[PDB]
Amino acid sequence: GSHSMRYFFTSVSRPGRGEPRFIAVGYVDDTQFVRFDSDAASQRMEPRAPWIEQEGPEYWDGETRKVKAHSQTHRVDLGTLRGYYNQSEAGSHTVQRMYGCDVGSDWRFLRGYHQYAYDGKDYIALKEDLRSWTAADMAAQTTKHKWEAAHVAEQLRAYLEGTCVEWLRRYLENGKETLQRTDAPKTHMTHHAVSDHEATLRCWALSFYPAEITLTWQRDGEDQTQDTELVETRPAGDGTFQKWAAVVVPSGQEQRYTCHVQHEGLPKPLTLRWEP
Amino acid sequence: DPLKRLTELALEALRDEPHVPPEDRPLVTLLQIALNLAINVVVNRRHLGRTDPEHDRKLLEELEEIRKLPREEAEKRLEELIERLEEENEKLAEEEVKQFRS
């Protein structure tokens, strides 16, 4: 019954082709609810979930002003890091920031996050105690010593433990119908002949929420990993997720295999066997 | 320590945001943006060794001048201060690059 709120920021430089492109998205659990794009014509924070549209104009005005200030900050960082690493003025580079908070099943503060990356590699991160920093190299130590002087850890701790948690509860309440739901996975098995003495059994999990799920094939009780193919959990486009796992089985020996599904919406882990 | 005072004002602004009438709330958000940029500018001048407490004091006087002032006239003064801080913050980062490589 634990929940989370997350903000993702991306800024990509395009030398010669205009100002850097800034994209920001906001998530509650596995549901996106806000977005911003510096290339979009609206130049505003936009809603992406129904339950967030009920917020007043003051909310959207304040969020737009803050996300625009952040876009300018990450714009400057692209120039700073390009100099810190003595890189060419004609290459495209990326900066990413992520921060958010977790609440337990009691909706009390559990965990806080704030990490920063350059070109997809860890740069600087706030530790779990939310009072000190983890720096990746000498350039990141420069940012660390500067942010320690500015008491950034103290400012981020007040937000992550207070404002972030309070607004997460507000969102969970306004979006109770969709956020506090737990759609159980609809499951089925399919059979496909790969030869005249072999076959493929594929175990499906569809239309489930949240995205966390476990699919396991076992043969006669033995964990059949290292011989099973698992695809990454993928979004269906309607707010639910999908996943499947498959194993190659000798013909006639299909009943010796079992599929096992663990999900938050399932009171008991399901067991599927091939039914002719 | 001017940076200490700016940090305490930012923590106060973040705590006051819930306990403020909805009409004053846009002014609170603009204050958080201005206070965040003031902290960024001062700490950038500290990192460059360009510590000038005279310039530091002028930033605080302008911010407190915007408060105690009617709401609509204060929201435009903060927007102008924010744009001016964003300009100087960009210039400071360009000199921070020159300092790092040398």
Partner: peptide, 10 residues
């Protein structure tokens, strides 16, 4: 809601 404070330049 976004963080109004603590987001500084690198």
């Amino acid at each position: 809601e976004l963080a109004g404070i603590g987001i500084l330049t690198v």
